[PDB]
Write a protein that binds this DNA or RNA. Structure first.
Lengths: 106, 96, 48, 45, 48, 94
RNA sequence: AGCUUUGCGCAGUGGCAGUAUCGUAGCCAAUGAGGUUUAUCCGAGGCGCGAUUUGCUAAUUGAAAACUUCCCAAUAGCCGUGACGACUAGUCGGCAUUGGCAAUUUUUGACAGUCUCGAGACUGG
Protein backbone atom coordinates (compact mmCIF):
# COMPACT_ATOMS: atom_id res chain seq x y z
CA UNK A 1 0.00 0.00 0.00
CA UNK A 2 1.91 2.99 -1.37
CA UNK A 3 1.09 6.28 0.44
CA UNK A 4 0.73 8.36 -2.74
CA UNK A 5 -2.58 7.31 -4.33
CA UNK A 6 -4.47 9.65 -1.96
CA UNK A 7 -3.60 12.92 -3.71
CA UNK A 8 -6.07 12.75 -6.62
CA UNK A 9 -9.19 11.31 -5.09
CA UNK A 10 -12.22 13.39 -4.37
CA UNK A 11 -14.34 10.61 -5.90
CA UNK A 12 -13.02 11.93 -9.21
CA UNK A 13 -12.19 9.90 -12.29
CA UNK A 14 -8.66 9.04 -13.41
CA UNK A 15 -7.65 8.44 -17.03
CA UNK A 16 -4.66 6.19 -17.63
CA UNK A 17 -2.31 7.30 -20.34
CA UNK A 18 0.57 5.05 -21.32
CA UNK A 19 3.14 4.52 -24.09
CA UNK A 20 4.66 7.88 -23.13
CA UNK A 21 8.17 9.05 -24.06
CA UNK A 22 10.55 8.54 -21.16
CA UNK A 23 12.95 11.31 -22.19
CA UNK A 24 10.30 13.97 -21.46
CA UNK A 25 6.66 14.57 -20.32
CA UNK A 26 7.19 15.31 -16.56
CA UNK A 27 4.83 18.32 -16.79
CA UNK A 28 4.12 18.25 -20.55
CA UNK A 29 1.11 16.03 -19.91
CA UNK A 30 -0.28 18.54 -17.40
CA UNK A 31 0.31 21.32 -19.96
CA UNK A 32 -1.66 19.39 -22.61
CA UNK A 33 -4.62 18.42 -20.41
CA UNK A 34 -4.82 21.75 -18.50
CA UNK A 35 -6.85 23.32 -21.35
CA UNK A 36 -9.75 21.03 -20.35
CA UNK A 37 -10.95 22.22 -17.86
CA UNK A 38 -8.84 24.05 -15.24
CA UNK A 39 -6.20 23.43 -12.57
CA UNK A 40 -5.92 19.69 -11.83
CA UNK A 41 -3.31 17.17 -10.71
CA UNK A 42 -1.62 15.03 -13.38
CA UNK A 43 1.36 12.84 -12.47
CA UNK A 44 3.82 10.82 -14.53
CA UNK A 45 5.37 7.67 -13.14
CA UNK A 46 9.11 8.30 -13.03
CA UNK A 47 10.66 5.60 -10.88
CA UNK A 48 13.18 6.39 -8.16
CA UNK A 49 16.94 5.62 -7.87
CA UNK A 50 17.01 6.13 -11.67
CA UNK A 51 15.04 9.23 -12.61
CA UNK A 52 13.69 7.30 -15.61
CA UNK A 53 10.06 7.44 -16.68
CA UNK A 54 8.22 4.11 -16.51
CA UNK A 55 5.88 5.06 -19.34
CA UNK A 56 2.36 5.47 -17.96
CA UNK A 57 0.78 8.50 -16.27
CA UNK A 58 -2.42 9.34 -14.38
CA UNK A 59 -4.52 12.43 -15.19
CA UNK A 60 -7.41 12.87 -12.69
CA UNK A 61 -10.45 14.70 -14.14
CA UNK A 62 -13.25 16.45 -12.22
CA UNK A 63 -16.11 15.13 -14.42
CA UNK A 64 -16.98 11.89 -16.23
CA UNK A 65 -18.60 14.16 -18.84
CA UNK A 66 -15.28 15.97 -19.19
CA UNK A 67 -13.55 12.58 -19.27
CA UNK A 68 -15.40 11.24 -22.34
CA UNK A 69 -14.59 14.29 -24.50
CA UNK A 70 -10.99 14.40 -23.26
CA UNK A 71 -10.47 10.66 -23.90
CA UNK A 72 -12.05 10.73 -27.38
CA UNK A 73 -10.15 13.83 -28.45
CA UNK A 74 -6.68 13.06 -27.04
CA UNK A 75 -6.53 9.38 -28.00
CA UNK A 76 -3.28 8.92 -29.92
CA UNK A 77 -2.76 12.70 -29.95
CA UNK A 78 0.91 13.68 -30.31
CA UNK A 79 2.15 14.55 -26.82
CA UNK A 80 5.91 14.99 -26.32
CA UNK A 81 7.20 12.41 -28.78
CA UNK A 82 4.95 9.33 -28.48
CA UNK A 83 1.20 9.03 -29.13
CA UNK A 84 -0.53 8.51 -25.77
CA UNK A 85 -2.76 5.44 -25.28
CA UNK A 86 -5.75 5.93 -22.99
CA UNK A 87 -7.66 3.47 -20.74
CA UNK A 88 -9.52 3.54 -17.44
CA UNK A 89 -7.60 3.35 -14.17
CA UNK A 90 -7.59 0.02 -12.33
CA UNK A 91 -6.88 0.98 -8.70
CA UNK A 92 -7.22 -2.67 -7.65
CA UNK A 93 -6.25 -2.13 -4.02
CA UNK A 94 -7.00 -4.28 -0.96
CA UNK A 95 -10.55 -3.11 -0.21
CA UNK A 96 -11.74 -4.03 -3.71
CA UNK A 97 -9.95 -7.29 -4.45
CA UNK A 98 -11.14 -8.61 -1.07
CA UNK A 99 -14.64 -7.86 -2.42
CA UNK A 100 -13.62 -9.49 -5.72
CA UNK A 101 -12.48 -12.68 -3.97
CA UNK A 102 -15.74 -12.67 -2.00
CA UNK A 103 -17.61 -12.32 -5.31
CA UNK A 104 -15.61 -15.19 -6.81
CA UNK A 105 -17.08 -17.89 -4.56
CA UNK A 106 -20.62 -16.51 -5.04
CA UNK B 1 -2.23 -5.88 -47.38
CA UNK B 2 -0.24 -3.23 -49.25
CA UNK B 3 1.95 -3.94 -52.31
CA UNK B 4 5.08 -3.37 -50.21
CA UNK B 5 3.73 -5.69 -47.53
CA UNK B 6 3.01 -8.31 -50.20
CA UNK B 7 6.60 -7.81 -51.39
CA UNK B 8 7.96 -8.38 -47.89
CA UNK B 9 5.68 -11.37 -47.34
CA UNK B 10 7.13 -12.87 -50.51
CA UNK B 11 10.70 -12.08 -49.40
CA UNK B 12 10.13 -14.07 -46.18
CA UNK B 13 11.14 -17.38 -47.91
CA UNK B 14 14.33 -15.67 -49.08
CA UNK B 15 14.96 -14.95 -45.40
CA UNK B 16 14.55 -18.58 -44.40
CA UNK B 17 16.67 -19.64 -47.40
CA UNK B 18 19.48 -17.24 -46.46
CA UNK B 19 19.33 -18.30 -42.82
CA UNK B 20 19.37 -21.95 -43.91
CA UNK B 21 22.41 -21.65 -46.16
CA UNK B 22 24.11 -19.17 -43.80
CA UNK B 23 27.08 -21.39 -42.72
CA UNK B 24 28.25 -21.74 -46.31
CA UNK B 25 27.27 -18.27 -47.56
CA UNK B 26 28.55 -16.29 -44.57
CA UNK B 27 32.03 -17.79 -44.59
CA UNK B 28 35.28 -16.01 -45.39
CA UNK B 29 36.06 -17.94 -48.57
CA UNK B 30 32.77 -16.80 -50.10
CA UNK B 31 32.83 -13.11 -49.17
CA UNK B 32 36.35 -11.83 -48.63
CA UNK B 33 36.30 -10.30 -45.18
CA UNK B 34 35.26 -6.87 -44.05
CA UNK B 35 34.40 -9.01 -41.06
CA UNK B 36 31.77 -7.04 -39.18
CA UNK B 37 30.93 -8.70 -35.90
CA UNK B 38 27.20 -8.70 -35.21
CA UNK B 39 26.25 -6.46 -32.31
CA UNK B 40 25.95 -8.07 -28.85
CA UNK B 41 26.58 -11.42 -30.56
CA UNK B 42 29.74 -13.31 -31.42
CA UNK B 43 28.79 -13.81 -35.08
CA UNK B 44 31.04 -12.30 -37.71
CA UNK B 45 29.30 -11.46 -40.97
CA UNK B 46 31.60 -11.70 -43.96
CA UNK B 47 29.86 -9.57 -46.55
CA UNK B 48 26.86 -7.31 -46.01
CA UNK B 49 24.12 -9.93 -46.17
CA UNK B 50 21.32 -7.79 -44.71
CA UNK B 51 18.69 -10.51 -44.86
CA UNK B 52 21.03 -12.75 -42.88
CA UNK B 53 21.78 -9.87 -40.50
CA UNK B 54 18.07 -9.48 -39.79
CA UNK B 55 17.56 -13.24 -39.35
CA UNK B 56 20.59 -13.72 -37.08
CA UNK B 57 19.71 -10.64 -35.04
CA UNK B 58 16.17 -11.96 -34.64
CA UNK B 59 17.61 -15.30 -33.51
CA UNK B 60 20.06 -13.70 -31.07
CA UNK B 61 17.71 -10.95 -29.94
CA UNK B 62 17.45 -9.99 -26.27
CA UNK B 63 21.11 -10.82 -25.51
CA UNK B 64 20.86 -14.53 -26.26
CA UNK B 65 24.63 -14.89 -26.73
CA UNK B 66 25.36 -13.60 -23.23
CA UNK B 67 22.48 -15.64 -21.84
CA UNK B 68 23.84 -18.79 -23.49
CA UNK B 69 27.31 -18.12 -22.07
CA UNK B 70 25.83 -17.31 -18.65
CA UNK B 71 23.68 -20.46 -18.60
CA UNK B 72 26.59 -22.66 -19.68
CA UNK B 73 28.87 -21.07 -17.05
CA UNK B 74 26.32 -21.47 -14.26
CA UNK B 75 25.44 -25.03 -15.27
CA UNK B 76 29.12 -25.96 -15.34
CA UNK B 77 29.61 -24.50 -11.88
CA UNK B 78 26.55 -26.53 -10.85
CA UNK B 79 28.47 -29.58 -12.12
CA UNK B 80 31.61 -28.54 -10.23
CA UNK B 81 29.66 -28.01 -7.01
CA UNK B 82 28.10 -31.45 -7.51
CA UNK B 83 31.62 -32.91 -7.85
CA UNK B 84 33.58 -30.78 -5.39
CA UNK B 85 35.31 -33.17 -2.98
CA UNK B 86 35.84 -36.10 -5.36
CA UNK B 87 38.07 -33.94 -7.57
CA UNK B 88 39.85 -32.41 -4.53
CA UNK B 89 38.38 -28.93 -4.99
CA UNK B 90 38.12 -26.38 -2.19
CA UNK B 91 35.61 -24.16 -3.96
CA UNK B 92 34.64 -22.72 -7.30
CA UNK B 93 34.66 -19.02 -8.11
CA UNK B 94 32.40 -17.55 -10.77
CA UNK B 95 34.86 -14.92 -11.99
CA UNK B 96 33.67 -11.32 -12.33
CA UNK C 1 2.03 -39.69 -32.79
CA UNK C 2 0.87 -41.11 -29.47
CA UNK C 3 0.56 -44.88 -28.96
CA UNK C 4 -2.97 -45.71 -30.06
CA UNK C 5 -5.19 -47.26 -27.43
CA UNK C 6 -4.39 -50.94 -27.81
CA UNK C 7 -5.57 -53.80 -25.63
CA UNK C 8 -2.21 -53.69 -23.82
CA UNK C 9 -2.26 -49.91 -23.28
CA UNK C 10 -5.89 -49.55 -22.10
CA UNK C 11 -4.81 -50.25 -18.52
CA UNK C 12 -3.66 -46.63 -18.41
CA UNK C 13 -7.33 -45.59 -18.68
CA UNK C 14 -7.94 -45.92 -14.94
CA UNK C 15 -5.18 -44.05 -13.14
CA UNK C 16 -5.72 -40.64 -11.54
CA UNK C 17 -5.32 -38.73 -14.81
CA UNK C 18 -8.84 -38.05 -16.13
CA UNK C 19 -9.39 -39.47 -19.63
CA UNK C 20 -12.24 -38.96 -22.12
CA UNK C 21 -13.43 -41.08 -25.04
CA UNK C 22 -14.87 -39.23 -28.03
CA UNK C 23 -16.95 -41.49 -30.27
CA UNK C 24 -18.16 -39.31 -33.15
CA UNK C 25 -19.40 -42.10 -35.41
CA UNK C 26 -23.08 -41.75 -34.48
CA UNK C 27 -23.22 -37.97 -34.97
CA UNK C 28 -24.65 -37.86 -38.48
CA UNK C 29 -27.22 -40.59 -39.02
CA UNK C 30 -30.10 -41.13 -41.45
CA UNK C 31 -33.14 -43.35 -41.96
CA UNK C 32 -33.95 -44.56 -45.47
CA UNK C 33 -37.72 -45.00 -45.79
CA UNK C 34 -39.62 -46.37 -48.79
CA UNK C 35 -43.08 -46.01 -50.01
CA UNK C 36 -43.44 -48.35 -53.00
CA UNK C 37 -45.28 -46.15 -55.47
CA UNK C 38 -43.82 -42.71 -55.94
CA UNK C 39 -40.34 -42.41 -54.48
CA UNK C 40 -38.02 -42.90 -51.50
CA UNK C 41 -37.07 -40.54 -48.69
CA UNK C 42 -34.04 -40.26 -46.42
CA UNK C 43 -34.68 -38.48 -43.13
CA UNK C 44 -31.64 -37.18 -41.25
CA UNK C 45 -32.17 -38.05 -37.60
CA UNK C 46 -30.46 -36.77 -34.49
CA UNK C 47 -27.11 -38.15 -33.38
CA UNK C 48 -24.74 -38.12 -30.46
CA UNK D 1 -24.07 -28.19 -12.02
CA UNK D 2 -27.06 -26.89 -10.06
CA UNK D 3 -25.02 -24.12 -8.40
CA UNK D 4 -23.84 -22.16 -11.47
CA UNK D 5 -27.18 -22.11 -13.28
CA UNK D 6 -28.78 -21.57 -9.87
CA UNK D 7 -26.81 -18.30 -9.80
CA UNK D 8 -27.84 -17.57 -13.39
CA UNK D 9 -31.39 -18.67 -12.45
CA UNK D 10 -31.42 -15.97 -9.77
CA UNK D 11 -29.97 -13.57 -12.35
CA UNK D 12 -32.54 -14.43 -15.01
CA UNK D 13 -35.18 -14.09 -12.31
CA UNK D 14 -33.62 -10.66 -11.75
CA UNK D 15 -33.80 -10.04 -15.50
CA UNK D 16 -37.43 -11.14 -15.92
CA UNK D 17 -38.20 -9.23 -12.72
CA UNK D 18 -36.65 -6.09 -14.21
CA UNK D 19 -38.74 -6.59 -17.35
CA UNK D 20 -41.78 -6.83 -15.08
CA UNK D 21 -40.52 -3.72 -13.25
CA UNK D 22 -40.33 -1.75 -16.49
CA UNK D 23 -43.81 -3.03 -17.24
CA UNK D 24 -44.85 -2.36 -13.63
CA UNK D 25 -44.04 1.30 -13.89
CA UNK D 26 -45.46 2.80 -17.11
CA UNK D 27 -48.66 0.79 -16.64
CA UNK D 28 -51.59 3.31 -16.80
CA UNK D 29 -52.02 2.57 -13.10
CA UNK D 30 -55.77 2.64 -12.46
CA UNK D 31 -57.06 6.02 -13.69
CA UNK D 32 -54.61 6.92 -16.44
CA UNK D 33 -56.54 4.32 -18.42
CA UNK D 34 -59.62 6.28 -17.38
CA UNK D 35 -58.32 9.64 -18.59
CA UNK D 36 -57.03 8.13 -21.84
CA UNK D 37 -60.33 6.37 -22.48
CA UNK D 38 -61.98 9.73 -21.78
CA UNK D 39 -59.74 11.63 -24.21
CA UNK D 40 -60.42 8.89 -26.74
CA UNK D 41 -64.20 9.15 -26.30
CA UNK D 42 -64.61 12.87 -25.55
CA UNK D 43 -64.08 14.64 -28.85
CA UNK D 44 -63.67 18.34 -29.55
CA UNK D 45 -67.33 19.23 -30.24
CA UNK E 1 -10.37 -29.64 -12.40
CA UNK E 2 -12.90 -31.54 -14.54
CA UNK E 3 -11.24 -30.98 -17.92
CA UNK E 4 -9.42 -34.09 -19.18
CA UNK E 5 -5.77 -34.21 -20.19
CA UNK E 6 -6.11 -37.30 -22.40
CA UNK E 7 -8.72 -37.66 -25.14
CA UNK E 8 -9.17 -40.86 -27.15
CA UNK E 9 -10.92 -40.75 -30.51
CA UNK E 10 -12.54 -43.95 -31.73
CA UNK E 11 -12.70 -42.93 -35.38
CA UNK E 12 -9.27 -41.96 -36.70
CA UNK E 13 -10.48 -39.03 -38.78
CA UNK E 14 -11.05 -36.80 -35.73
CA UNK E 15 -7.70 -36.46 -33.95
CA UNK E 16 -6.38 -34.12 -36.65
CA UNK E 17 -9.28 -31.62 -36.21
CA UNK E 18 -8.92 -32.11 -32.45
CA UNK E 19 -5.31 -30.97 -32.75
CA UNK E 20 -6.53 -27.75 -34.38
CA UNK E 21 -9.52 -27.00 -32.15
CA UNK E 22 -7.67 -27.66 -28.87
CA UNK E 23 -4.68 -25.35 -29.21
CA UNK E 24 -6.19 -23.38 -26.33
CA UNK E 25 -5.44 -26.55 -24.31
CA UNK E 26 -1.92 -27.81 -25.13
CA UNK E 27 -1.97 -29.72 -21.81
CA UNK E 28 -4.21 -32.45 -23.25
CA UNK E 29 -3.25 -35.56 -25.19
CA UNK E 30 -5.21 -36.60 -28.28
CA UNK E 31 -4.49 -40.22 -29.19
CA UNK E 32 -6.28 -42.62 -31.49
CA UNK E 33 -7.65 -46.02 -30.57
CA UNK E 34 -6.87 -49.50 -31.84
CA UNK E 35 -9.83 -50.83 -29.86
CA UNK E 36 -13.17 -49.46 -31.06
CA UNK E 37 -16.04 -49.45 -28.61
CA UNK E 38 -19.67 -49.96 -29.70
CA UNK E 39 -21.42 -46.83 -28.52
CA UNK E 40 -24.07 -47.38 -31.17
CA UNK E 41 -25.28 -49.94 -28.63
CA UNK E 42 -26.09 -46.87 -26.54
CA UNK E 43 -28.28 -45.74 -29.46
CA UNK E 44 -29.90 -49.18 -29.52
CA UNK E 45 -31.08 -48.99 -25.89
CA UNK E 46 -34.49 -47.30 -25.90
CA UNK E 47 -33.78 -44.65 -23.25
CA UNK E 48 -30.80 -42.98 -24.94
CA UNK F 1 -8.62 -56.80 -12.30
CA UNK F 2 -5.71 -57.41 -10.00
CA UNK F 3 -6.38 -56.86 -6.30
CA UNK F 4 -3.62 -55.52 -4.07
CA UNK F 5 -3.39 -58.84 -2.29
CA UNK F 6 -3.02 -58.80 1.47
CA UNK F 7 0.33 -60.41 2.42
CA UNK F 8 1.57 -59.49 -1.08
CA UNK F 9 3.49 -56.75 -2.90
CA UNK F 10 3.85 -58.10 -6.46
CA UNK F 11 0.18 -57.56 -7.29
CA UNK F 12 0.71 -53.85 -6.68
CA UNK F 13 3.56 -53.89 -9.20
CA UNK F 14 1.31 -55.70 -11.68
CA UNK F 15 -1.29 -53.01 -10.90
CA UNK F 16 0.96 -49.98 -11.36
CA UNK F 17 2.59 -51.44 -14.47
CA UNK F 18 -0.91 -52.02 -15.85
CA UNK F 19 -1.89 -48.45 -14.94
CA UNK F 20 1.32 -47.18 -16.55
CA UNK F 21 2.66 -45.32 -13.53
CA UNK F 22 6.21 -46.54 -14.23
CA UNK F 23 47.96 -38.36 -15.84
CA UNK F 24 46.93 -41.40 -13.72
CA UNK F 25 43.21 -40.50 -13.54
CA UNK F 26 40.96 -41.44 -10.64
CA UNK F 27 38.89 -44.10 -12.43
CA UNK F 28 35.24 -43.60 -11.64
CA UNK F 29 31.91 -42.49 -13.12
CA UNK F 30 30.98 -38.82 -12.63
CA UNK F 31 27.20 -38.95 -12.83
CA UNK F 32 26.61 -35.41 -14.01
CA UNK F 33 23.01 -34.42 -13.50
CA UNK F 34 22.22 -31.01 -14.98
CA UNK F 35 18.87 -30.07 -13.53
CA UNK F 36 16.78 -26.90 -13.53
CA UNK F 37 14.47 -26.31 -10.59
CA UNK F 38 12.57 -23.45 -9.04
CA UNK F 39 12.49 -22.73 -5.31
CA UNK F 40 9.63 -25.19 -4.70
CA UNK F 41 11.66 -28.10 -6.09
CA UNK F 42 9.68 -28.61 -9.30
CA UNK F 43 11.57 -29.83 -12.35
CA UNK F 44 11.58 -26.84 -14.65
CA UNK F 45 10.62 -26.61 -18.31
CA UNK F 46 13.55 -25.34 -20.45
CA UNK F 47 11.43 -22.45 -21.73
CA UNK F 48 10.71 -21.31 -18.18
CA UNK F 49 14.21 -22.25 -17.01
CA UNK F 50 15.40 -19.80 -19.67
CA UNK F 51 12.72 -17.41 -18.40
CA UNK F 52 14.12 -17.59 -14.85
CA UNK F 53 17.64 -17.17 -16.27
CA UNK F 54 16.57 -14.15 -18.31
CA UNK F 55 14.66 -12.56 -15.42
CA UNK F 56 17.82 -12.86 -13.36
CA UNK F 57 19.87 -11.68 -16.35
CA UNK F 58 17.88 -8.55 -17.19
CA UNK F 59 17.23 -7.90 -13.50
CA UNK F 60 13.56 -7.17 -14.24
CA UNK F 61 11.09 -9.99 -13.64
CA UNK F 62 7.48 -10.22 -14.67
CA UNK F 63 4.74 -7.68 -14.06
CA UNK F 64 2.03 -8.12 -11.48
CA UNK F 65 -0.61 -9.54 -13.84
CA UNK F 66 1.59 -12.20 -15.44
CA UNK F 67 2.75 -13.28 -11.97
CA UNK F 68 -0.92 -13.52 -10.96
CA UNK F 69 -1.63 -15.72 -14.00
CA UNK F 70 1.49 -17.84 -13.43
CA UNK F 71 0.92 -18.34 -9.68
CA UNK F 72 -2.77 -19.12 -10.17
CA UNK F 73 -1.70 -21.56 -12.90
CA UNK F 74 0.63 -23.39 -10.51
CA UNK F 75 -2.07 -23.78 -7.89
CA UNK F 76 -4.45 -24.88 -10.67
CA UNK F 77 -1.97 -27.73 -11.24
CA UNK F 78 -1.76 -28.28 -7.47
CA UNK F 79 -5.55 -28.39 -7.00
CA UNK F 80 -6.01 -30.57 -10.08
CA UNK F 81 -3.36 -33.17 -9.38
CA UNK F 82 -4.13 -33.52 -5.66
CA UNK F 83 -7.35 -35.33 -6.59
CA UNK F 84 -18.96 -34.21 -9.94
CA UNK F 85 -19.96 -37.84 -10.43
CA UNK F 86 -21.60 -38.13 -7.01
CA UNK F 87 -23.34 -34.78 -7.58
CA UNK F 88 -24.58 -36.12 -10.92
CA UNK F 89 -25.87 -39.28 -9.22
CA UNK F 90 -27.58 -37.21 -6.52
CA UNK F 91 -29.17 -34.93 -9.11
CA UNK F 92 -30.34 -37.94 -11.13
CA UNK F 93 -33.65 -36.44 -7.27
CA UNK F 94 -35.68 -37.10 -10.43
C1' A G 1 -65.92 -2.24 -18.02
C1' G G 2 -63.64 -6.14 -20.60
C1' C G 3 -62.17 -8.42 -25.20
C1' U G 4 -59.62 -7.26 -29.67
C1' U G 5 -57.09 -5.23 -34.60
C1' U G 6 -53.22 -2.40 -36.96
C1' G G 7 -48.68 0.55 -36.81
C1' C G 8 -44.69 2.16 -33.76
C1' G G 9 -41.48 2.14 -29.29
C1' C G 10 -39.41 -0.58 -24.92
C1' A G 11 -37.87 -4.99 -22.52
C1' G G 12 -37.82 -10.54 -22.25
C1' U G 13 -37.77 -16.05 -23.91
C1' G G 14 -36.08 -18.43 -28.23
C1' G G 15 -34.30 -18.62 -33.25
C1' C G 16 -31.19 -16.79 -37.28
C1' A G 17 -26.83 -14.05 -38.94
C1' G G 18 -21.68 -13.65 -45.40
C1' U G 19 -27.29 -16.17 -51.21
C1' A G 20 -27.31 -12.82 -43.85
C1' U G 21 -27.80 -7.56 -42.02
C1' C G 22 -27.11 -2.72 -43.78
C1' G G 23 -24.92 2.24 -45.67
C1' U G 24 -25.28 4.67 -50.30
C1' A G 25 -23.63 10.98 -50.18
C1' G G 26 -23.84 7.92 -57.40
C1' C G 27 -28.06 7.06 -60.53
C1' C G 28 -33.03 5.15 -61.37
C1' A G 29 -38.07 4.37 -58.84
C1' A G 30 -45.49 4.28 -57.86
C1' U G 31 -45.24 10.74 -63.29
C1' G G 32 -43.78 2.79 -62.07
C1' A G 33 -38.80 -0.63 -59.78
C1' G G 34 -38.81 -5.49 -61.72
C1' G G 35 -41.48 -9.22 -64.28
C1' U G 36 -40.01 -16.39 -68.58
C1' U G 37 -46.35 -18.28 -64.48
C1' U G 38 -51.97 -16.12 -65.51
C1' A G 39 -49.55 -10.45 -69.64
C1' U G 40 -55.60 -5.48 -71.46
C1' C G 41 -51.86 -9.39 -65.89
C1' C G 42 -48.78 -8.57 -61.52
C1' G G 43 -46.86 -3.81 -58.22
C1' A G 44 -41.59 -2.53 -54.72
C1' G G 45 -37.62 -0.96 -54.14
C1' G G 46 -33.66 -1.90 -58.02
C1' C G 47 -28.35 -1.47 -60.36
C1' G G 48 -23.59 -0.52 -59.05
C1' C G 49 -19.87 0.95 -55.14
C1' G G 50 -18.78 0.01 -50.02
C1' A G 51 -19.07 -2.31 -45.46
C1' U G 52 -19.96 -5.36 -41.49
C1' U G 53 -19.33 -0.81 -32.14
C1' U G 54 -18.45 -1.93 -26.90
C1' G G 55 -17.10 -4.56 -22.15
C1' C G 56 -15.15 -9.13 -19.73
C1' U G 57 -12.07 -13.41 -19.59
C1' A G 58 -8.66 -17.17 -21.24
C1' A G 59 -4.21 -18.72 -23.74
C1' U G 60 0.43 -17.96 -26.31
C1' U G 61 5.10 -15.85 -27.59
C1' G G 62 8.24 -12.36 -25.59
C1' A G 63 13.45 -10.69 -20.75
C1' A G 64 9.61 -7.19 -20.14
C1' A G 65 2.29 -7.91 -22.47
C1' A G 66 2.48 -1.95 -18.78
C1' C G 67 -2.26 0.78 -12.88
C1' U G 68 2.27 4.17 -9.24
C1' U G 69 13.85 -8.25 -7.39
C1' C G 70 18.09 -11.42 -5.90
C1' C G 71 22.16 -12.83 -2.63
C1' C G 72 25.52 -13.16 2.09
C1' A G 73 26.35 -13.60 7.71
C1' A G 74 24.08 -14.50 12.36
C1' U G 75 19.57 -15.27 15.96
C1' A G 76 14.75 -17.14 16.58
C1' G G 77 16.24 -35.12 23.93
C1' C G 78 19.75 -38.72 25.86
C1' C G 79 24.57 -40.99 26.40
C1' G G 80 30.45 -38.81 26.78
C1' U G 81 33.53 -34.72 27.30
C1' G G 82 35.12 -29.30 29.69
C1' A G 83 34.55 -25.99 33.32
C1' C G 84 31.71 -23.62 37.07
C1' G G 85 29.11 -24.76 41.28
C1' A G 86 27.04 -27.71 45.32
C1' C G 87 27.30 -32.04 48.62
C1' U G 88 30.27 -36.22 50.79
C1' A G 89 37.79 -40.51 44.44
C1' G G 90 32.21 -40.62 44.53
C1' U G 91 27.26 -38.05 43.94
C1' C G 92 23.94 -34.11 42.18
C1' G G 93 22.12 -29.46 39.37
C1' G G 94 22.52 -26.10 35.47
C1' C G 95 25.44 -24.48 31.32
C1' A G 96 28.50 -25.51 26.97
C1' U G 97 29.65 -28.66 22.38
C1' U G 98 34.88 -30.80 19.20
C1' G G 99 31.77 -38.54 18.84
C1' G G 100 27.36 -41.73 18.87
C1' C G 101 21.99 -42.79 19.14
C1' A G 102 17.23 -49.20 13.51
C1' A G 103 19.66 -55.95 17.16
C1' U G 104 15.43 -58.56 23.38
C1' U G 105 13.46 -53.54 28.70
C1' U G 106 11.13 -48.72 25.50
C1' U G 107 11.98 -43.85 20.09
C1' U G 108 12.65 -46.95 14.12
C1' G G 109 7.06 -50.99 15.02
C1' A G 110 4.43 -58.71 16.01
C1' C G 111 1.75 -56.66 12.66
C1' A G 112 -1.92 -57.60 8.99
C1' G G 113 -6.10 -60.26 7.15
C1' U G 114 -10.59 -63.41 8.58
C1' C G 115 -15.01 -65.04 11.41
C1' U G 116 -18.99 -65.11 15.80
C1' C G 117 -22.59 -63.16 19.72
C1' G G 118 -18.70 -54.68 24.96
C1' A G 119 -16.24 -60.40 24.36
C1' G G 120 -13.53 -64.36 22.04
C1' A G 121 -11.88 -67.88 17.89
C1' C G 122 -8.90 -68.83 12.89
C1' U G 123 -4.81 -67.96 9.47
C1' G G 124 -0.07 -65.97 7.85
C1' G G 125 0.90 -73.62 4.30
Amino acid sequence: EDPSLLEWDADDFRIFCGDLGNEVNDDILARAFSRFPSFLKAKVIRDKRTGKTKGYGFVSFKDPSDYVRAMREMNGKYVGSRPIKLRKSMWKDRNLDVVRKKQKEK
Amino acid sequence: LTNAQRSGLNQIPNRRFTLWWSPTINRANVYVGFQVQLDLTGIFMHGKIPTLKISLIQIFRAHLWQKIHESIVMDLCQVFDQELDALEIETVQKET
Amino acid sequence: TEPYLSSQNYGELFSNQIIWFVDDTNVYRVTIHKTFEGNLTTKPINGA
Amino acid sequence: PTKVEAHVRAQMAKRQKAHEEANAARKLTAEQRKVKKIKKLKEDI
Amino acid sequence: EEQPKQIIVTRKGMLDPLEVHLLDFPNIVIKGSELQLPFQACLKVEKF
Amino acid sequence: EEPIVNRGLAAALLLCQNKGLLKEKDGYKPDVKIEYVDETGRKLTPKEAFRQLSHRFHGKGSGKMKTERRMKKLDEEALLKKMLGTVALLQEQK
